[PDB]
Design an enzyme around this catalytic site. Structure first.
Site, PDB file in Angstrom:
ATOM      1  N   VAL A  58     -21.565 -49.601 -25.645  1.00  0.00           N
ATOM      2  CA  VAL A  58     -22.692 -49.731 -24.750  1.00  0.00           C
ATOM      3  C   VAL A  58     -22.930 -50.960 -24.534  1.00  0.00           C
ATOM      4  O   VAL A  58     -23.668 -51.896 -25.405  1.00  0.00           O
ATOM      5  CB  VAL A  58     -24.138 -48.893 -25.453  1.00  0.00           C
ATOM      6  N   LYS A  65     -28.325 -47.943 -16.932  1.00  0.00           N
ATOM      7  CA  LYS A  65     -28.446 -46.458 -16.691  1.00  0.00           C
ATOM      8  C   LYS A  65     -29.063 -45.696 -17.155  1.00  0.00           C
ATOM      9  O   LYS A  65     -29.589 -44.679 -16.637  1.00  0.00           O
ATOM     10  CB  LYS A  65     -26.886 -46.184 -16.123  1.00  0.00           C
ATOM     11  N   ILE A  99      -1.854 -33.332  -9.731  1.00  0.00           N
ATOM     12  CA  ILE A  99      -2.618 -34.250  -8.677  1.00  0.00           C
ATOM     13  C   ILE A  99      -3.398 -35.121  -9.784  1.00  0.00           C
ATOM     14  O   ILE A  99      -4.463 -34.711 -10.121  1.00  0.00           O
ATOM     15  CB  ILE A  99      -3.578 -33.326  -7.937  1.00  0.00           C
ATOM     16  N   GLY A 182      -7.665 -26.898 -25.936  1.00  0.00           N
ATOM     17  CA  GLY A 182      -7.439 -27.000 -24.707  1.00  0.00           C
ATOM     18  C   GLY A 182      -5.946 -26.917 -24.407  1.00  0.00           C
ATOM     19  O   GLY A 182      -5.663 -26.263 -23.116  1.00  0.00           O
ATOM     20  N   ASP A 247       3.104 -28.016 -24.755  1.00  0.00           N
ATOM     21  CA  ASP A 247       4.026 -29.279 -24.724  1.00  0.00           C
ATOM     22  C   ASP A 247       4.945 -28.915 -25.889  1.00  0.00           C
ATOM     23  O   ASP A 247       4.518 -28.410 -26.912  1.00  0.00           O
ATOM     24  CB  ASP A 247       3.351 -30.422 -24.679  1.00  0.00           C
TER      25      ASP A 247
HETATM   26 NA    NA Z   1      -4.965 -33.299 -11.841  1.00  0.00          NA
HETATM   27 NA    NA Z   2     -23.311 -52.398 -27.658  1.00  0.00          NA
END
Ligand code: NA
Ligand code: NA
Ligand code: NA
EC number: 2.7.7.7
Length: 326
Positions: A58, A65, A99, A182, A247
């Site tokens: 950070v 922000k 993509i 995933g 994979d």
């Molecule tokens: Na993609």
């Molecule tokens: Na930092």
DNA sequence: CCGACCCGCATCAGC
DNA sequence: GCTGATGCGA
DNA sequence: GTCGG
């Protein structure tokens, strides 16, 4: 909010996606993610950017922000990106596998912005992108561990039906015991395939899995890496399972367990183990562990016939995959 | 101040 | 036809 | 964007 800081983490992840997909600034993308991972582990509701800035990864801009987000409940810059038609369309199209930022930009430049627009312009898509489009929804679903176990049994059995000498390991967070995944990442080897040495070893396994209709589609395939699509068989009466990404990597037997270690992770565990291996006079990559000479010159790869061997070289008690979260 | 930040395969650019 | 660059995916 | 040579 999540575990104290989900708003900040969600905001950083969104900013990361815009850097990767729209600005094409992959290092900024990874900077935001790392900051999100650190913050996600910080066990306090952050109250100021200055507090967050103390954390590694950070800096001044993420701190600012965070201050804006805390004072106001929003980020202006993120609000305007959200309503920008080009940025939101580019971001969306990269959700299609195949993509990336470049193809997304060119599509949007030509008025192709939605899945309907892609469905209409298939001849403009390559093979990978057509498969990503066909399974757009399925590829964004997570895979429960229960299904990964079943998927694992099919791969290990089919591999054994081709040649009993194949060794195959399902790695990724699933091997660390994760409750969902995933995708499925399979590492394969065979004694006849070494770094110094019989053909069609990957092909035979991919072919077997296609024969029994587990592998349904191919995204890419060469002599050492397959990326494709698989699906568990249906109960003949229950709903069909979603198609999944798989994979398969063929690795030289003498580099297998270094690969199994690498691709089991975690990423934090790998950086830590490599860092400890250096301070013991060893260098470990995804393929070998080699001793370092006194001037830092890497010597020849040391023999490795299990994950344990690697731990033994660097004077580290073996840690089960379950315990490699860091 | 300014560069680092970790390859296999499909497909394009160019020859 | 080839070689090398680029995009892509994790 | 963040870090550090
Ligand atoms: Na993609
Ligand atoms: Na930092
Ligand atoms: Na994507």
């Amino acid at each position: 909010q999540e575990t104290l800081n989900g708003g900040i983490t969600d905001m950083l992840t969104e900013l990361a996606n815009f850097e990767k997909n729209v600005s094409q600034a992959i290092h900024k993308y990874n900077a935001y993610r790392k900051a999100a991972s650190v913050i996600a582990k910080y066990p306090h509701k952050i109250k100021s950017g200055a507090e967050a800035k103390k954390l590694p990864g950070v800096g001044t801009k993420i701190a600012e922000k965070i201050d804006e987000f805390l004072a106001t409940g929003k980020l202006r810059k993120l609000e305007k990106i959200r309503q920008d038609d080009t940025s939101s369309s580019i971001n969306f199209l990269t959700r299609v596998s195949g993509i990336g930022p470049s193809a997304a930009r060119k599509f949007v430049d030509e008025g192709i912005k939605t899945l309907e627009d892609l469905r209409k312009n298939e001849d403009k898509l390559n093979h990978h992108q057509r498969i990503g489009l066909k399974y757009f929804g399925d590829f964004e679903k997570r895979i429960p561990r229960e299904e990964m176990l079943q998927m694992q049994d099919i791969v290990l059995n089919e591999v054994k039906k081709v040649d009993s000498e194949y060794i195959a390991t399902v790695c990724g967070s699933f091997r660390r015991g994760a409750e969902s995944s995933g995708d499925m990442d399979v590492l394969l080897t065979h004694p006849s395939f070494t770094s110094e040495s019989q053909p069609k070893l990957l092909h035979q396994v991919v072919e077997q899995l296609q024969k029994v209709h587990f592998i349904t589609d191919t995204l890419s395939k060469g002599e050492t890496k397959f990326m494709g699509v698989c699906q568990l068989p249906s109960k003949n009466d229950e709903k069909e399972y979603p198609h999944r990404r798989i994979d398969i990597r063929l690795i030289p037997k003498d580099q297998y367990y270094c690969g199994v270690l690498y691709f089991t992770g975690s990423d934090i565990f790998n950086k830590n183990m490599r860092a400890h291996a250096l301070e013991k006079g060893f260098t470990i990559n995804e393929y070998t562990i080699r001793p370092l000479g006194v001037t830092g010159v890497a010597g020849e790869p040391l023999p490795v016939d299990s994950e344990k061997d690697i731990f033994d070289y660097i004077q580290w008690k073996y840690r089960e995959p379950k315990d490699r979260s860091e």
